[PDB]
Amino acid sequence: RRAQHNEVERRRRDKINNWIVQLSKIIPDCNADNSKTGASKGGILSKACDYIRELRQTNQRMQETFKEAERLQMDNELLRQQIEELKNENALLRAQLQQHNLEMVGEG
Amino acid sequence: RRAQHNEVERRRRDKINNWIVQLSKIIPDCNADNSKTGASKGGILSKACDYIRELRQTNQRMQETFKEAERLQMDNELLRQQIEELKNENALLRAQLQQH
Amino acid sequence: RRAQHNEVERRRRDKINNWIVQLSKIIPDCNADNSKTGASKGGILSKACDYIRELRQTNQRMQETFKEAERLQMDNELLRQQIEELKNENALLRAQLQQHNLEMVGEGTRQ
Amino acid sequence: RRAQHNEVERRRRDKINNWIVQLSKIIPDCNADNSKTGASKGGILSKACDYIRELRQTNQRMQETFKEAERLQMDNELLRQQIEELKNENALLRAQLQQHNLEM
DNA sequence: GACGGGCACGTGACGCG
DNA sequence: CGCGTCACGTGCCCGTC
DNA sequence: GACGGGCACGTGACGCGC
DNA sequence: GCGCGTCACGTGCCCGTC
């Protein structure tokens, strides 16, 4: 009667534990912490719960540095122009300093 | 009594359920799919199993292109830093040709 | 008379060119940039002048994170004390809710 | 006639001197401490040749440890973010119990 | 003695082609 | 009539106190 | 024809120590 | 009381693109 219902629980409880061990086998943290708390069913959950939080953290780094990728490469064109306008004037003026400082020493 | 041991298990069961519920609240697969088996506790695990293992596979496809994308901001600082090195030399040179 | 001083200068220029190729061999950009201006003597200067700027940018970035790795103890005590303070209160108050939410069904039924 | 080619050589020799002086002004081995023998232009090259050779092995030592040191800020982001989730849940739970007309 | 906390197992309840 | 959710109890083999 | 630019090579000039 | 050793400057020439 309900003794057949005991077997359906045994199936479905076994499903959950075997889902944790598959979960356990794929988190790197559970495969290096030889402890009786990490190896617990309750540990794998809060470990994967964290693992996802950190996997979504790296993923949300990747996305965020793409919305700005067009703008900063646009900035690259700008500051790549600013170096040359400054360097040419830097070279122009260093020629205009180092060749006129010399015209004042022996001016007469 | 054993009434402390019922509370201990109830605490342990509450931590567990709050750790699939937090798990439930974050996987987009079971987010607002309202399934009778998908929203079950055993399903979130298969959904988290299929979300961790998919995010791992994703972020390695990303790191192929991301490391090259990362350098573009390193350069943005670099070439930004060059500007002041030459802006100081330019301003140094700009305030020395005055008396000639 | 000065043909011995042509020897003195040729020695010096050879030193400088071979101090460029020694430089040229140790900058990774010139090691793979088959360019007429990159392979120029003057190119190796502005390539090494950049290559140094970027290594300075890394070490001066690399160390500046150690002045703040001091604050691994900061987020320890932000993790050690704070997260359990709220989790225990979270689990406590969530149990205080759902013990009286069972009496809500007790008081008012649906028919 | 050739006066433009003299000016062109003058510009080219200016760029490389500006490139050794830009080089000289950053290598600490000759950062306004070194003599007339080491501020020699051929000497700055051997010192930049050292500085680069010496920084690559230094850079490679740091990132052996820095990689583990970096993730402390990653976790600082992580653990600072966990606080927000629990604060929202704790704020959610603290006000749903003020409608239960009994706190503790 | 004091309790905790681990994991597996039964039940009743409830919603189901 | 069996499924299948679920939380809740229950020993027990065991920890640390 | 027009200019630029590459690199090697030769000089006077200058600072030097002996 | 001159051997070195700095350095920039010119110059051919072997050669690019406009």
Author numbering:
A (entry chain A): 236 to 343
B (entry chain B): 236 to 335
C (entry chain E): 236 to 346
D (entry chain F): 236 to 339
Question: What does the publication say?
Answer:
Upstream stimulating factors (USFs), including USF1 and USF2, are key components of the transcription machinery that recruit coactivators and histone-modifying enzymes. Using the classic basic helix-loop-helix leucine zipper (bHLH-LZ) domain, USFs bind the E-box DNA and form tetramers that promote DNA looping for transcription initiation. USFs belong to the basic helix-loop-helix leucine zipper (bHLH-LZ) transcription factor family, which also includes the MiT/TFE members microphthalmia-associated transcription factor (MITF), transcription factor EB (TFEB), transcription factor EC, and transcription factor E3 (TFE3) and the MYC-subfamily members myc proto-oncogene (MYC), MYC-associated factor X (MAX), MAX dimerization protein, and MAX interacting protein 1 (MXI1). USFs also form a bivalent homotetramer in solution.
To investigate the structure of USF2, we prepared a recombinant protein fragment of human USF2 from the basic region to the C terminus (isoform 1, residues 235–346), including the complete bHLH-LZ domain according to the UniProt database annotation. We cocrystallized this protein with E-box DNA and solved the crystal structure to a resolution of 3.5 Å. One asymmetric unit (ASU) contains four protein chains (A, B, E, and F) and four single strands of DNA (chains C, D, G, and H). Chains A and B as well as E and F form compact dimers to bind duplex E-box DNAs formed in pairs of C and D chains and G and H chains, respectively. In each dimeric USF2-DNA complex, the basic region (from Arg236 to Lys250) forms a helix to bind the major groove of E-box DNA. Interestingly, the rest of the C terminus of one chain of the dimer from Arg329 to Glu342 also forms an α-helix extending LZ (hereafter denoted as the Ext region). LZ-Ext adopts a prominent bent structure with helixes twisted by approximately 125° in both chain A and chain B. Because of the additional leucine spaced seven residues (from Leu321 to Leu328) and the Ext region, the LZ-Ext helix of USF2 is significantly longer than that of other bHLH-LZ transcription factors. In fact, the two dimers further form a compact tetramer in rotational symmetry with a two-fold axis. Finally, we observed that Lys271 in the loop region binds the backbone of G(−7) through a salt bridge.
